[PDB]
């Protein structure tokens, strides 16, 4: 505060759909006071206990039971940054574990689960306070959500079907910023469709709508992309300033 230039003021790359790009004050506090994205959500926190039980039962070997002089090949697994154990087949584990998440044996909004292949680590997070956003799931080079789910959403006008049911189909997922680093994320159904040799075909998530990266005040401003970027920031202050 008051005399210190720094890089935690400049919009960082990871703030994509996590925190509004252009909604931070124009005064000395610029960029330090940020504003949450529209689709952004924040994990409320949960006990790690169930995950630990499923892992030990699946095939995770306990720390003091293994032999240290034989672990180089093995992948280290952590839960809330606590090093719980080791594994010799992380690919079947990750695939199975996510499947459980889609099926809700562990809480979606909660568990973040990340694999860092080049380091052979598996980090899992269930602590409070992580910023995450909903995305569509794509599978076998195409979207997993089908128009029949839409017809239930139209039906909601007189039925109990809801966004929670939509999460229960496992067609949408919650992704925190640490996990968002390791996904291959298509911009829009259109692009994921036309693709043949256009770019790649390995996508795993897709954006529910790209204009969601904006925070509350930035959404009032129409055609924000035909404006010079700081121009959008002055409007986010002034819109908040108007009366009515």
């Amino acid at each position: 505060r008051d005399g210190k230039l720094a890089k935690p003021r400049q919009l960082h790359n990871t703030l994509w759909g996590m925190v509004c790009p252009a909604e931070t004050p124009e005064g000395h506090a610029v960029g330090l006071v940020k504003n949450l994205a529209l689709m952004a959500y924040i994990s409320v926190g949960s006990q790690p206990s169930p995950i630990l039980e499923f892992l030990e039962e699946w095939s995770m070997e306990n720390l003091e039971e293994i032999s240290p002089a034989a672990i180089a090949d093995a992948t280290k697994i952590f839960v809330n940054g606590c090093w719980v154990g080791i594994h010799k087949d992380p690919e079947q584990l990750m695939n199975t574990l996510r499947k459980l998440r889609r099926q809700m044996d562990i809480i979606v909004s909660e568990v973040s689960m990340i694999r860092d292949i080049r380091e052979r680590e598996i980090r899992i997070y269930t602590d409070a306070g992580r910023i995450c956003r909903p995305l569509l799931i794509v599978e076998k080079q195409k979207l997993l959500l089908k128009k029949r789910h839409i017809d239930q959403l139209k039906e909601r006008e007189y039925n109990n079907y809801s966004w929670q049911d939509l999460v229960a189909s496992g067609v949408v997922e919650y992704i925190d910023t640490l996990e968002e680093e390791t996904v291959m994320l298509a911009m829009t159904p259109d692009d994921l469709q036309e693709k043949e040799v256009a770019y790649c075909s390995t996508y795993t998530h897709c954006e529910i709508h790209p204009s969601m990266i904006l925070g509350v005040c930035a959404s009032i401003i129409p055609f924000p992309d035909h404006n010079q970027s700081p121009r959008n920031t002055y409007q986010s202050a002034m819109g908040k300033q108007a009366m009515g």
Binding site: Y41, L145, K147, I150, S162, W163, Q164, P189, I208, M212
Partner: peptide
């Protein structure tokens, strides 16, 4: 399986209707 703009907004609306 195809589904357009008209429909993702249905999905978004359901997010705010719920949350």
């Amino acid at each position: 399986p195809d589904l357009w703009q008209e429909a993702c907004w249905i999905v978004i609306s359901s997010y705010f209707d719920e949350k």
